[PDB]
Amino acid sequence: MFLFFFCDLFWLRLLLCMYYCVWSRLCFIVYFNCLMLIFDFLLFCLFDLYLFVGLCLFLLLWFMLFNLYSLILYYCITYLNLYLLFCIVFLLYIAFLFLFCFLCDFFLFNNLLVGDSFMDVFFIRFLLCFLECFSLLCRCLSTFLRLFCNLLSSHFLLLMFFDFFYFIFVFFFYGVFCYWFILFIFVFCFCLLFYVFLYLLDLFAAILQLFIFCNMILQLIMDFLLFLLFV
Amino acid sequence: TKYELKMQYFDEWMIRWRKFQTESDWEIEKGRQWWRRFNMAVSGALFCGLVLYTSGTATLKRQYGLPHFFDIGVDGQAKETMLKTLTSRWRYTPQGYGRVLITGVPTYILFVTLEHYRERRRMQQYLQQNTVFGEQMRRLLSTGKIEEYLPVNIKATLPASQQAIYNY
Amino acid sequence: GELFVRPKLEEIPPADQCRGFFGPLNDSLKFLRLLDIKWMMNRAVAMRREYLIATPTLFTFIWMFTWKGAVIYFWGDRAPPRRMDWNTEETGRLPLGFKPTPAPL
Amino acid sequence: VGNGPTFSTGGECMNTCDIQNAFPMNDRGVRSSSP
Amino acid sequence: FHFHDVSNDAIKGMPPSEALHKHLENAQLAHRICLAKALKAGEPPVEKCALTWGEVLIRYQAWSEYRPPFQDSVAQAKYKKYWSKKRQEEDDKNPF
Amino acid sequence: STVAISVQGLHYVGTGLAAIALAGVGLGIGTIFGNLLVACARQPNLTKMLFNYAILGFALTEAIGLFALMLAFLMLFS
Amino acid sequence: STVAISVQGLHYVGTGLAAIALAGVGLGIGTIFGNLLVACARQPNLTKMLFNYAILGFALTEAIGLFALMLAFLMLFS
Amino acid sequence: STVAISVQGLHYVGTGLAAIALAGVGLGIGTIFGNLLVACARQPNLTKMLFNYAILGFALTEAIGLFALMLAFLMLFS
Amino acid sequence: MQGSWSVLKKNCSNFFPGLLAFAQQTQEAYGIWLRIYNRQQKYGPTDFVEQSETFSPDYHKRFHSQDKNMWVDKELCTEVSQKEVARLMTYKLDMWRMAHCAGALLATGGYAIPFGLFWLANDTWVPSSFNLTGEELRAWREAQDLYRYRSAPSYLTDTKWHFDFHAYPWNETQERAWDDLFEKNDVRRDPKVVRPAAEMYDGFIKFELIRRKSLRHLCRSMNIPTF
Amino acid sequence: SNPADHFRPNLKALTLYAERQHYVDRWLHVKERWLAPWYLPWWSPLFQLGTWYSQRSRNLFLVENHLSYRPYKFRRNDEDRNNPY
Amino acid sequence: VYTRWKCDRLPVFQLKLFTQEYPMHAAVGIFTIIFLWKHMSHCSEETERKYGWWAGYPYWRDPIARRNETKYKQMIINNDVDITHPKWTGCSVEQLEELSRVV
Amino acid sequence: EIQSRKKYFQTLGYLVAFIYLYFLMPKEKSFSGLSGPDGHWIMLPKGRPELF
Amino acid sequence: LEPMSTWYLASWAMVWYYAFFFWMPMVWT
Numbered sequence A: 001m002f003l004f005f006f007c008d009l010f011w012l013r014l015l016l017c018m019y020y021c022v023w024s025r026l027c028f029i030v031y032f033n034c035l036m037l038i039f040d041f042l043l044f045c046l047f048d049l050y051l052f053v054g055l056c057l058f059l060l061l062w063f064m065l066f067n068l069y070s071l072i073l074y075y076c077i078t079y080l081n082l083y084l085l086f087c088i089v090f091l092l093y094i095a096f097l098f099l100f101c102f103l104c105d106f107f108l109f110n111n112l113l114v115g116d117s118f119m120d121v122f123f124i125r126f127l128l129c130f131l132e133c134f135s136l137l138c139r140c141l142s143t144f145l146r147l148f149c150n151l152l153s154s155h156f157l158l159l160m161f162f163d164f165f166y167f168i169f170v171f172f173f174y175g176v177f178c179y180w181f182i183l184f185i186f187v188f189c190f191c192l193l194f195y196v197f198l199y200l201l202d203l204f205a206a207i208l209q210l211f212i213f214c215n216m217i218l219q220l221i222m223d224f225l226l227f228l229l230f231v
Numbered sequence B: 001t002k003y004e005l006k007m008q009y010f011d012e013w014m015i016r017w018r019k020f021q022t023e024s025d026w027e028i029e030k031g032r033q034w035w036r037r038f039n040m041a042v043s044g045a046l047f048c049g050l051v052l053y054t055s056g057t058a059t060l061k062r063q064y065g066l067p068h069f070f071d072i073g074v075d076g077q078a079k080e081t082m083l084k085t086l087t088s089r090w091r092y093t094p095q096g097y098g099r100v101l102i103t104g105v106p107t108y109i110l111f112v113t114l115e116h117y118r119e120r121r122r123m124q125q126y127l128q129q130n131t132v133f134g135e136q137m138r139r140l141l142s143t144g145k146i147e148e149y150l151p152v153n154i155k156a157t158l159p160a161s162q163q164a165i166y167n168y
Numbered sequence C: 001g002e003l004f005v006r007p008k009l010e011e012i013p014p015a016d017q018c019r020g021f022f023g024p025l026n027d028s029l030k031f032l033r034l035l036d037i038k039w040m041m042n043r044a045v046a047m048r049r050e051y052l053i054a055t056p057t058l059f060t061f062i063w064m065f066t067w068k069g070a071v072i073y074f075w076g077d078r079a080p081p082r083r084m085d086w087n088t089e090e091t092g093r094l095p096l097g098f099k100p101t102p103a104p105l
Numbered sequence D: 001v002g003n004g005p006t007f008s009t010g011g012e013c014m015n016t017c018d019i020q021n022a023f024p025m026n027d028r029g030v031r032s033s034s035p
Numbered sequence E: 001f002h003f004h005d006v007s008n009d010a011i012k013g014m015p016p017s018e019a020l021h022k023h024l025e026n027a028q029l030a031h032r033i034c035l036a037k038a039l040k041a042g043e044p045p046v047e048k049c050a051l052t053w054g055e056v057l058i059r060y061q062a063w064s065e066y067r068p069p070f071q072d073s074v075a076q077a078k079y080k081k082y083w084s085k086k087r088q089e090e091d092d093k094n095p096f
Numbered sequence F, G, H: 001s002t003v004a005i006s007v008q009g010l011h012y013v014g015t016g017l018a019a020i021a022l023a024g025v026g027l028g029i030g031t032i033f034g035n036l037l038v039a040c041a042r043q044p045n046l047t048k049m050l051f052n053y054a055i056l057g058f059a060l061t062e063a064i065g066l067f068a069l070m071l072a073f074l075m076l077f078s
Numbered sequence I: 001m002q003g004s005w006s007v008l009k010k011n012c013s014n015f016f017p018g019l020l021a022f023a024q025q026t027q028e029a030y031g032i033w034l035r036i037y038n039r040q041q042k043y044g045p046t047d048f049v050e051q052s053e054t055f056s057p058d059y060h061k062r063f064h065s066q067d068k069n070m071w072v073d074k075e076l077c078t079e080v081s082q083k084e085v086a087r088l089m090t091y092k093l094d095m096w097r098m099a100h101c102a103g104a105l106l107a108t109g110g111y112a113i114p115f116g117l118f119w120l121a122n123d124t125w126v127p128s129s130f131n132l133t134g135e136e137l138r139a140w141r142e143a144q145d146l147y148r149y150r151s152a153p154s155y156l157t158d159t160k161w162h163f164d165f166h167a168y169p170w171n172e173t174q175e176r177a178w179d180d181l182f183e184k185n186d187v188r189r190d191p192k193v194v195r196p197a198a199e200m201y202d203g204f205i206k207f208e209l210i211r212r213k214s215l216r217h218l219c220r221s222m223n224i225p226t227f
Numbered sequence J: 001s002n003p004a005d006h007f008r009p010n011l012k013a014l015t016l017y018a019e020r021q022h023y024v025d026r027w028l029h030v031k032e033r034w035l036a037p038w039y040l041p042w043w044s045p046l047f048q049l050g051t052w053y054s055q056r057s058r059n060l061f062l063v064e065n066h067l068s069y070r071p072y073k074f075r076r077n078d079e080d081r082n083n084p085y
Numbered sequence K: 001v002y003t004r005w006k007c008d009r010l011p012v013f014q015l016k017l018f019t020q021e022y023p024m025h026a027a028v029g030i031f032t033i034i035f036l037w038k039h040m041s042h043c044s045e046e047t048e049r050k051y052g053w054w055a056g057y058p059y060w061r062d063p064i065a066r067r068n069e070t071k072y073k074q075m076i077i078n079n080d081v082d083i084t085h086p087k088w089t090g091c092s093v094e095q096l097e098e099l100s101r102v103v
Numbered sequence L: 001e002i003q004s005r006k007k008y009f010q011t012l013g014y015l016v017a018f019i020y021l022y023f024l025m026p027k028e029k030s031f032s033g034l035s036g037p038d039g040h041w042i043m044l045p046k047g048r049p050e051l052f
Numbered sequence M: 001l002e003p004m005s006t007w008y009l010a011s012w013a014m015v016w017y018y019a020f021f022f023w024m025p026m027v028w029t
């Protein structure tokens, strides 16, 4: 089976072509932490710690073109599938993990064995190492699951509320002319307030979820970085 | 001669018509698997030997010197013996692409040669078989094409409870 | 976190100081050090070779999370049924009177 | 005067940006939007 | 002619090979019935018997792929290891 | 014997149980805001960092609340 | 055999379970106002800002109550 | 005698119970951030280390909640 | 330099004479290298001969140490002359490029022929022995210089940017040395003023910690094949 | 249900089907055509890359002796749990 | 001065980007694509009927049946398949004629 | 200049594509069958009688 | 729910793979 379809960004691709044929400065970045990894001067890293900037920026742009514009009614999030997000997070996370593993430095994993020599090695430290190795994969899974479920739930809620608003607005507006107009006016104002609140909440939540999605990958990278001090 | 190009069609057909796989063919495939594992083992041993031979003197001293993890006494004796054996004579210890080539090319050549000749051996074995698979192999080598549904054409043997289809 | 420096040869405690599951495997019990996993773990921790404990674990997880997971899921053998359909070893053989084609020559 | 654009600013206030020193300051105390 | 019973209830207590063979025989019977009807009507067989032929083809594909396992040392060892007396008793006790 | 049943109304029960998860979500939000007021009382100048972090936590909890709401709708509309 | 049972009274249970979600909302609001009173005494000069923040938190909790209440009425009628 | 009954709707009720585990997750997250604001109010300069540890705690808590979601979806589709 | 039909014809015409000259140079360079290697193994320091291991402090990855894994044979003039050393270096470059090409040929069988056509159309990666006249040698040198111009600025910018964004000089003299090290070739740099930068960078990054991307840029600038 | 139906791609244009046997056979023919010529020796890395892994996978499939039944990959109906056929 | 992004054409820059900037990511992406097309590229007829149609499967015209019919007719006509062969029918041609005369 | 020309052509192409997609292209697998294709099989064998 | 479906997962993921391998270089340059 081979299905031929198209993403829902064609108009946005046209706009990007129209507006970015000429250069322009970028100063606001959703995830700015990918550009400043070191805060204490004289610390430098021999590992390619800035390799994630390009992928981070492209992912932010793509996910913003999809999610933020999905608030507009009937707009489609073409990539919204659990296993597709699993594929994306697998690509990124496992790529960085295999970059660290291909380094062939086993000492890099010394920190996996949690605790000190005082703790029993077999009955405490080994169990902690097992749990942390499990927690890495769980972090990957959690990133992808959170990204999927936030969008799915928010859009379900928006659709349900819009259906209720349409129903009451269409089939109960005549009450404006009746003696119970005050009840309808109260309900209508309540609905407008909830509409605005839902839109604001979704707007903020999409950006925040993208921030956290990039933050998880940067955290994975940071968990294996070692900084040397200039002398 | 390139036996893999001929054998890929036969293997795919056998997978599609695996029901008619006699125990002899199954044994042939198990032997092929065992020989693949043996080839892998010998290639790995050769690669390890080449790596050890070309290792630097300081590297060998660090690897086969103190401390001893177990300190049983046999471990130290063996490590000292190996270190002395390696460091006694002069050894060509290249680095970079040279070591890569020296360590890999022999291993790759050995593995590929062994696997190719084992593939030829398996082709001969299937040729010598007196089962439907052997007939299919002979027909493939003769006409150059795989004849699907051959077992039902020549009426290959079936279980006593499944011979009704042949009843014509 | 911080940089790791391998211990010097003089900073490594002696093997006899290591403890096993029950007690130290000193003289008359050295050959049991090979079989005692906890003794080996303690020795590795003492010698600062902790990676020997961590590297096999993490890698294993990866090997499961990447390649063997799907292999088991898609091609693994489930539990056998109660009534088993064994092979009668009757299928495959050529029928009587069949003239097989000659082998290459 | 024409209606053409100028050196882009990205919507950043040069009096508080992290590279403010690279923008010259005029008599009024307002840093320039361009070099 | 008589079609075999390949319903879920009947299939439940049947070996895979027997079920596959029964499905193949049913497909062949349906195809031959359709061909006989076409011949009686005199119309071409290809224009009427395509779907039945395809069903026979797919049943053949499913039937020829399965090879019942050979009963040997390792297979018997696995079967005995999984099916212990305790497990057999538990299965007998279970109503499902 | 071999028996099989399907109850239509059970999907309502599962929906209500999922909604209970919001009890630990709404309370969690109050805890964040409860701490926020105390923090703002003893560090008025640093209201910016505290208010932003309070929003951050609220959205994080709201994610969990949205997790449960999705299951509730799935068990309510299907 | 196969049975298709439709119970007409199970939506009451689901509605009640959804209504339980308000226990968290009420407690969350109580926590917000409890901290507000403590904070006001600590730094009374910032009463208005703390009052506004408490209202913000209350609104967010009330919305969660509406989501929980949304699942209640739907089940109750549907 | 022994009667095997295969009820279908019981896979919904179990799902709703699993979601209740989220109640202890959302509250736990709120506790972390509630303490974060106070900690920032007490040692505001140390905001970064507190923020990172809060994220670490939030991550670990979220992992537990997902395990509940894993069970919830497994039962919902079973 | 971009490929051209004239260069393709030039290299095709001189292909077999070039191979023969390369073989003769291979024999001569093998003799020279045998002499040099014997001298190094006999009179070299213990660390240099035993290939002492130097590991980075962060990921413990081995790399050549300038102090230990490099040795200057002060008494090499007795056995090997300067011209022989220059010949050996030139043959090393040519042999590296020829080895890469031969490896590609062996790997891809007969499917490398069109890529061989692309190769002979450019003088960037052809051996110096393929030039049988002064003009051809001049064009080949021009191609090499073009490759060096293409690659060097990236390496210089990488080094300067990484250091300047992750560290600063300690004293004024080091500041001047660093600033004057990366001046354009139009101006003349005083080696005495610039030398302290060597110690400063030794403080920052030695040759044993050089990163793989910077190594790729350096190899590009040195006309060493990288793929 | 109806709300769930809103999360589908909205620009589906065409669907093409192909049996695994057919396109696998076509790919094998292409590979044989490209790996046949004499100027590509069997010991070259490219030829081995092309052939060895496929041979190993097919051999692993052939040696397989599973006590359980694996339903046909391309059945007409695979949505029924109580009917592997 | 020379820069990959500014001087190279798009295909060359793409190859450079995914070979000397993000090679591991490209390798993992190809691995995942191969897995997806090896294990998630099939759909049975029942699955298509249940979920494969926007508004539902139109049983009143059964498009799947017509699609399969066209497929099988094309295969038979092009490959010159004798669908009356005993293997397809399970009986001899004479038996088929007898059955046709009977029914 | 190069980017301006390229983006001009790309904008025209994307405008054509957008118009076709959102105003002309029919959705596949329609219930009534009045618009869009129902799909078909490809790569079928041809001229291979031995295959069957 | 299609978001939970896998009957056409490969064709669905082709969109992301095209975006990553073919559109990222264009957005990059």
Ligand SMILES: CCCCCCCCCCCCCCCCCC(=O)OC[C@H](COP(=O)([O-])OCC(O)COP(=O)([O-])OC[C@@H](COC(=O)CCCCCCCCCCCCCCCCC)OC(=O)CCCCCCCCCCCCCCCCC)OC(=O)CCCCCCCCCCCCCCCCC
Pocket: A002, A003, A004, A005, A006, A007, A013, J016, L009, L010, L013, L014, L016, L017, L020, L021, M011, M012, M014, M015, M018, M019, M022, M023
């Ligand atoms: C049998 C029926 C026919 C179908 C046959 C199919 C055969 C299939 C074989 C088997 C394949 C199996 C695997 C399939 C997997 C599919 C997966 C999938 O789809 O995932 C979704 C996923 C969706 O991606 P997306 O996010 O939508 O972005 C991709 C877009 O292309 C947009 O992304 P982008 O913008 O980033 O792309 C770059 C874009 C950059 O932007 C542009 O260049 C702008 C233009 C964009 C064009 C592409 C968008 C298409 C929009 C819809 C169609 C437009 C109208 C067509 C009108 C048709 C009318 C009938 O540049 C281009 O696209 C370059 C092409 C430009 C062409 C310009 C031509 C100008 C001609 C001028 C002629 C003038 C003549 C004058 C004469 C005068 C005489 C006097 O698809 C893909 O990733 C691509 C899948 C492709 C797989 C390969 C298929 C094989 C090739 C088939 C070619 C058929 C040609 C013959 C057709 C004839 C008409 C019927």
Ligand SMILES: CCCCCCCCCCCCCCCCCC(=O)OC[C@H](COP(=O)([O-])OCC(O)COP(=O)([O-])OC[C@@H](COC(=O)CCCCCCCCCCCCCCCCC)OC(=O)CCCCCCCCCCCCCCCCC)OC(=O)CCCCCCCCCCCCCCCCC
Pocket: A098, A101, A102, A103, A104, B033, B036, B037, B038, B040, B041, B043, B044, B045, B048, B049, C059, C060, C062, C063, C066, C067, C068, C071, J056, J060
């Ligand atoms: C450097 C990288 C760092 C970054 C890593 C980044 C990634 C994360 C890491 C984790 C991996 C992530 C996963 C990513 C996907 C990668 C692909 C993948 O997973 O595919 C697996 C995939 C799994 O197979 P499958 O497709 O699922 O099919 C299953 C079938 O079994 C397939 O059937 P088959 O026909 O292919 O056969 C396969 C065969 C493979 O094995 C063989 O063919 C035979 C053995 C080969 C040996 C190779 C050479 C080893 C060294 C030789 C000796 C050297 C020293 C010589 C000098 C000695 C002086 C005394 O295995 C078996 O069937 C098992 C046979 C076991 C027999 C055991 C008999 C009992 C006695 C021996 C054991 C017990 C001893 C007790 C002693 C007690 C003493 C007190 O492929 C394979 O594993 C098999 C093919 C590849 C074989 C490669 C063999 C070499 C492996 C490397 C060895 C050296 C490095 C390790 C040590 C390093 C130390 C510093």
Ligand SMILES: CCCCCCCCCCCCCCCCCC(=O)OC[C@H](COP(=O)([O-])OCC(O)COP(=O)([O-])OC[C@@H](COC(=O)CCCCCCCCCCCCCCCCC)OC(=O)CCCCCCCCCCCCCCCCC)OC(=O)CCCCCCCCCCCCCCCCC
Pocket: A104, B043, B048, B051, B094, B095, B096, B097, B099, B100, B103, B104, B105, B107, B108, B111, C059, C063, I055, I060, I061, I062, I063, J045, J046, J048, J049, J052, J053
């Ligand atoms: C179409 C062809 C297809 C080919 C496929 C095969 C793979 C690709 C072939 C090669 C491709 C070309 C490029 C390769 C990488 C080059 C790396 C490089 O630049 O190295 C420079 C380096 C030269 O630099 P150097 O300064 O002279 O020395 C390096 C320094 O020591 C460096 O100093 P350092 O400070 O960095 O020291 C650390 C260094 C120390 O290491 C070294 O440098 C020493 C050399 C390596 C030693 C490796 C052996 C270690 C001991 C193994 C013991 C095994 C016992 C098992 C017993 C089992 C009993 C049952 O590295 C390590 O510590 C790494 C140790 C290895 C860990 C392996 C972990 C594997 C995890 C497996 C996970 C699970 C897998 C799946 C499941 C399997 C089981 C079911 O090269 C070498 O030293 C050796 C290079 C060897 C290249 C590979 C040769 C390939 C031969 C292939 C033959 C078979 C062909 C099959 C064809 C099939 C049909 C198509």
Ligand SMILES: CCCCCCCCCCCCCCCCCC(=O)OC[C@H](COP(=O)([O-])OCC(O)COP(=O)([O-])OC[C@@H](COC(=O)CCCCCCCCCCCCCCCCC)OC(=O)CCCCCCCCCCCCCCCCC)OC(=O)CCCCCCCCCCCCCCCCC
Pocket: B094, B095, B096, B097, B098, B099, B100, B101, B102, B103, B104, B105, B106, B107, B108, B109, B110, I026, I029, I030, I033, I095, I096, I098, I099, I100, I101, I102, I103, I104, I106, I107, J043, J044, J045
């Ligand atoms: C037929 C089977 C084929 C198998 C498949 C092969 C597939 C292709 C892979 C590449 C194979 C090699 C290609 C030819 C290279 C030319 C010979 C050579 O090594 O030149 C020296 C040169 C050494 O480089 P280096 O960086 O200077 O070495 C540092 C050492 O410290 C240097 O040490 P040093 O500083 O002390 O100085 C020593 C120097 C001093 O000498 C000199 O200065 C005098 C000049 C000597 C070298 C002359 C080279 C001339 C090259 C051009 C030849 C003519 C081409 C004509 C083309 C047109 C024809 C019409 O002499 C050397 O260079 C000696 C190096 C050590 C020997 C290496 C050869 C080992 C393999 C051969 C034996 C095989 C035995 C098999 C047994 C089987 C048992 C079962 O070679 C290179 O440039 C390296 C190769 C570059 C391409 C690498 C591509 C990736 C390779 C990955 C292989 C992984 C394992 C295999 C599996 C692959 C699976 C994917």
Ligand SMILES: CCCCCCCCCCCCCCCCCC(=O)OC[C@H](COP(=O)([O-])OCC(O)COP(=O)([O-])OC[C@@H](COC(=O)CCCCCCCCCCCCCCCCC)OC(=O)CCCCCCCCCCCCCCCCC)OC(=O)CCCCCCCCCCCCCCCCC
Pocket: I001, I002, I003, I100, I101, I102, I104, I105, I112, I113, I115, I116, I117, I118, I119, I120, I121, I122, I124, I125, I227, K008, K011, K012, K015, K016, K019, K027
């Ligand atoms: C007889 C001779 C003597 C004997 C033989 C001797 C040995 C010879 C061999 C060795 C030679 C070595 C030296 C070679 C140097 C030249 C290299 C080169 O190519 O330079 C660029 C070369 C031009 O060089 P240049 O002008 O001198 O500039 C050099 C500068 O220095 C610029 O330099 P640069 O540094 O900027 O350029 C570098 C650039 C080089 O690249 C390029 O420049 C790209 C070239 C292609 C561009 C194509 C653009 C046009 C596309 C058209 C598309 C179709 C249009 C429509 C057609 C319609 C037809 C009807 O980038 C790269 O190097 C990237 C490397 C990427 C490596 C990829 C590795 C993948 C590994 C996979 C992962 C594995 C992981 C491990 C997995 C392990 C699992 C176990 O490019 C071309 O000439 C382009 C040719 C385009 C041909 C037409 C389009 C393709 C036609 C395909 C036909 C297919 C027919 C069959 C179809 C069948 C269908 C079923």
Ligand SMILES: CCCCCCCCCCCCCCCCCC(=O)OC[C@H](COP(=O)([O-])OCC[N+](C)(C)C)OC(=O)CCCCCCCCCCCCCCCCC
Pocket: A083, A084, A086, A087, A090, C065, C066, C067, C068, C069, C070, C071, C074, C075, J053, J057, J060, J061, K031, K032, K034, K035, K036, K038, M006
């Ligand atoms: C309604 C049901 C819903 C179920 C949902 C279930 C979850 C589905 C999630 C899908 C989306 C997420 C996918 C993430 C990625 C998963 C990856 C995965 O597990 O794939 C494994 C699979 C396993 O492959 P396989 O299935 O072909 O395994 C063959 C094993 N035998 C032969 C025994 C059957 O990998 C692939 O699909 C890619 C294989 C080709 C690429 C790798 C080749 C090199 C292999 C090296 C080792 C062996 C050779 C020797 C060394 C090299 C010599 C040259």
